[PDB]
Amino acid sequence: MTGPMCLIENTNGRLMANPEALKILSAITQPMVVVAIVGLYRTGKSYLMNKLADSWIFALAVLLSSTFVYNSIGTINQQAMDQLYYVTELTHRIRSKSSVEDSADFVSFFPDFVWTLRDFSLDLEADGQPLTPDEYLTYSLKLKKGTSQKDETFNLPRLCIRKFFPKKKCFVFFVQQVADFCSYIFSNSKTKTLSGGIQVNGPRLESLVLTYVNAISSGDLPCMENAVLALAQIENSAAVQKAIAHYEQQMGQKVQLPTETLQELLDLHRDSEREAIEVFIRSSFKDVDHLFQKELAAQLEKKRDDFCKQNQEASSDRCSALLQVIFSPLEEEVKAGIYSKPGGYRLFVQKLQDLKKKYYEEPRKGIQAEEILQTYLKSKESMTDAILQTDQTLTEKEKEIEVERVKAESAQASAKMLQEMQRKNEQMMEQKERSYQEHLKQLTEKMENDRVQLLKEQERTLALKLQEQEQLLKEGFQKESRIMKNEIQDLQTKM
Amino acid sequence: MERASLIQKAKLAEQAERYEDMAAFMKGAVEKGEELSCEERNLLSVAYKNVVGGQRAAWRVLSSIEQKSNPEVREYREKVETELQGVCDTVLGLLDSHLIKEAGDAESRVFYLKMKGDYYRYLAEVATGDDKKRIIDSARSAYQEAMDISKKEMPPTNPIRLGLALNFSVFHYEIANSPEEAISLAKTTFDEAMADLHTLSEDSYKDSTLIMQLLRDNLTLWT
Amino acid sequence: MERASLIQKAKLAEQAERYEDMAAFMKGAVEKGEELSCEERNLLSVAYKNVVGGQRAAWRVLSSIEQKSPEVREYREKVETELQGVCDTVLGLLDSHLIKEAGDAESRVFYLKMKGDYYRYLAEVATGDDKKRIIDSARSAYQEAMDISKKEMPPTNPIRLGLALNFSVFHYEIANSPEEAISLAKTTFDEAMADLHTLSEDSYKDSTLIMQLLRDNLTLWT
C-alpha cells in the first residue's frame, strides 16, 4: 500500500465496508498487528498514526485491534473522564457470546489500552521523585469512596478501563516522546488473535470487518463469538475441500490399477485418508457437532467406492482378456477335434493344467481372478467329460477315477472363488471400522488440544481478574473487590 | 455453641457477605482455645479485613471532604475513627491474648505478627501527633519480628513471606514516610523470589506470582 | 442535634457509603417534626433501600443454601429478624410522621409506595397467614398510591412509574399473579412511551431508567 485507504465508510448515518479495501485485505496472508487510534476530533490522531507508519466507530476499533490507543489533549480530569463514557457504553455495543455480566468476558479478548495525552501540562512532581506517566495513569484511575450518584459516575469509567482491558499504558506528549511511543508499539503490540490462538491475517480481518459491520447495519450488536463462528464456516468449508483434494492427489499418484490385491488398494486408501483427515484437522476450528468432519467422511467414502469400482472393473477387464488369450486356443483345438483321438485325454488334461498355471502366474490380475476363472471353467465343464468318454486308451475303471478327480477339482475351484468373495467382504468391513476409528482418533486428539488451549486462555483471564481484585482491595475498595471475586467464580465454572 | 458450627456460620456469613457477622463468628472460634487451621486463619482475616476496609474507605472519603483542615463533617469523621479503632482493638486483643505464640509452625507465627502489623498500620493512618509515632513503632516491631521469622523459616517464594514483605513495604511508603527503604525492600523481596521461582511448581507458583505482581505494581507506582 | 446538620451528616454518610449511619441520621431528621423536601425524601429511601437491600440479599443467599441440601436455619432467622426490625422502623416512621402528613400528591404517593415496598419485603420472609395479612397490607398501600397517581400525575412522572414498577413486582413475585404483573408493566410502559415526547429534561433521566426496568422485567417474566 503506497498510502492509506478507507476501510469502513460512514455516509448518511450508515457504516459500510469498502469493497476495494476488503480486496486488498484478501491478498495479505501474513499475520497482522493491528493498532487503532480513537479520540476527540482535532487532537492530532492522524498525525501520530503517521509517525507509526461515534459509539460504533469506537466499538469497531476495539473489536478489530491488538492495541487500542485513546488520544486526548490535556490531563486526566473530570472533563476528560466524561468523554470516556464511550468506553462505559461498550457494554451496550459489544456482545462476547450469543449462547451486566457479558462484559466480564471483555478482558479475555479486548486489546491492550494505551492513553496518549497531548499538550500535557503537568510536571508530575512528587515527594522524592516525579511520577512516571504510567504511575500517573494509575493515580488517575484510582476510585473514590461513596455510594452517591456523583461517586458512581466518577468510578464507572475508571472501573471500565481497569476491568475491560488486559493491559494499560500511558504516554504524555516531544520528538523523543513520539519515538518512545512508537518503540513501545513496535515491541509490545501483539499479533491480533481470536479465541483458540487463531492469528488474524488479511482474509481473517476481512471476515471480521464484514461480520461486525453487517451486524451493525442489521440493527444487531456485533458479537465476538458469532464472528469467530462465521470465520469457522468459511475456513472449515475450505478445509474439507483441501482435504479431499489431498486425498485425490495422493491416491492418484500411488494407485496402479488393477491392484495386486484388495488389501493393496485399501492400504493406500487408509494412508491417503489419514493424511487427508490430518489436513482437515490442522486447517479447521470450532467444528461444532463435527458437521464438517462428517461431511469430509461422507466424501472420502464416496471417493473410496469409486476407486473400488474402477479397480474391480480393471480386474474384470484384465482377467477376461487373459481368458481369451490363454483358453480360447484350447477351446478351438477341442472343437477342431485335436484331442478326440486315442490318448487325447491325457494330452488335454495336461494342456489344461498348464494353461491354468499360466493364468495364475500372470501378474496383477486383480481381485476378480478366481471368480472370472471359475465361472468360465464351470461353464465349460462338459468339455472335459466329452474328451474323457471318447478316449479308448483308458479303461472304464480309469475313467470312473477321472470323473471323481474332476469333480473334486471343480469343488476346489468353487472354494477358491467362494473364499475370494468372503475375504473381500471381510476386508471392506475391516476398513470401514478402521476409517471410523481414524476419524475418532484424530478428532479426540484435536478436542484435547482445543481443551488445553482454552484452559490456557482462561488461566490468563483468571490471572488478570485476580490481579485487579487485589489492586481494588489494596486500594481499599471491598465492595468492588468482592464483585471481582464474583466474576472469578463464574469464570471457574467454565473451566 | 460448638466451634465447628461457629466456623460454619463464618462461612455462611461470608457467602451472605455479612463480614461483621463473620468476624464475630471467627472471634468465637478463636476464643475456643484451639489453633486455627490454614483455611480458618484466612476466614479470620477475610472477615476483619472487609469490616475495616469499609471503615477506612469511609474515613478517607470524609477526610478528603474535610480537606484535612480547610462542623458536622468533623464530628462524623471522628465517629468513624472511633469505630475503626474499636475493630482494630478487638483484633489486637484476639492476637495478643490468644493467637500470638499460642501457635507452633512458622507460617502461623508470621501470619499473626503480620496481621498485628497490619492493624497497627490502620490505627496509624487515622492517628496524628505523637500518637501516630508510638503506633508506627509498635507496627514496625510486629512487622519486623514477622520478617525475622520468615527470613529464617521460609523460602523467598512463600506467599505469606511475600505478603508480609509487601505490606511492610507499603508501611514504609504510606506510613513511615521512608520511600527509598520501601522501594529497596520491594525490589529485593521481588528479585530473591525470582531467583528461586525456576523451581517453584504450580503447587504454589500461582500464589507467589499473584503477590509478585503487586510488588512490581507498587514499585512502578512509587517511581 | 439540629435537623440541618442531621441532613448534612446523611449526605456525608452516603458519600462514604455508610448507609446504616445515613438511615439513622435521616430518621433523626424525620422525628424533628417537619416534612421532607424532594431531595430529603430520596435520601431517606436511598439510605433504607441500601440497608434493607443488604439484608434481603443475605437472606436469599442463605435460604437457598438451606434448601440446597442446623446452622443455616439459625443464621437465616437472625438475618430475617434483623430485616424485620428495619422494615418495622421504616413503616413506623411512615405511619406517624410521613404518610398524608403533607399535601402534595407526589409526596403522598412516594410515602404510600414506600409503605408498599416495606410490607412487600416483610412478605418475602413471612409464612402462612402472617404472610396473607402482610401481603394484603402491602397491596392496599400500593393501590392507594396508584389511585392517587392516576388522578394527580401524568403517565411519565417518575414517581408514578416507580410505583407502577414495584407494584408489578408485587404481583409477580409476591401475589403469585404473573398475568396481572405483565399487563400492568406493559400498560405502564406503553402509556409512558405514548407521552415521552416533551417529558421535560426535568424528570427525564429518572422515568427513562424506570421504563427500562419495566422492559427488563417484561422480558424476564415472559
Numbering used by the authors:
A (entry chain A): 7 to 59, 112 to 157, 165 to 238, 262 to 583
B (entry chain C): 1 to 70, 79 to 231
C (entry chain B): 1 to 69, 79 to 231
Lines quoted from the article behind this entry:
Human GBP1 is a membrane-active large GTPase that can disrupt microbe-encapsulating membranes. GBP1 has a C-terminal prenylation site that enables its membrane association and forms homo-/hetero-dimers and membrane-bound coatomers with itself or with other GBPs. Ser156-phosphorylated GBP1 was sequestered in the cytosol by 14-3-3σ, thereby preventing self-inflicted damage, in a mechanism reminiscent of how Rnd3 GTPase is inactivated.
Ser156 of GBP1 is part of a flexible, surface-exposed loop and is the central serine of a putative, evolutionarily conserved mode I 14-3-3 binding motif. We next reconstituted the GBP1-PIM1-14-3-3σ interaction in vitro and found that they formed a ~125 kDa complex in the presence of ATP, most likely composed of one monomer of GBP1 (67 kDa) and a 14-3-3σ dimer (dimer: 56 kDa). To visualize the interaction between phosphorylated GBP1 and 14-3-3σ, we solved the structure of the purified protein complex using single particle cryogenic electron microscopy (cryo-EM). While the overall resolution did not permit de novo modelling, we were able to unambiguously dock previously reported crystal structures as rigid bodies based on secondary structure features. For GBP1, both Ser156 and Thr590 would be involved in sequential two-step 14-3-3-binding, with the initial recognition by Ser156 and subsequent stabilization by binding to Thr590. In summary, our model suggests that phosphorylated GBP1 is sequestered by 14-3-3σ, acting as a molecular padlock to keep the protein inactive through inhibition of dimerization and GTPase-activity.
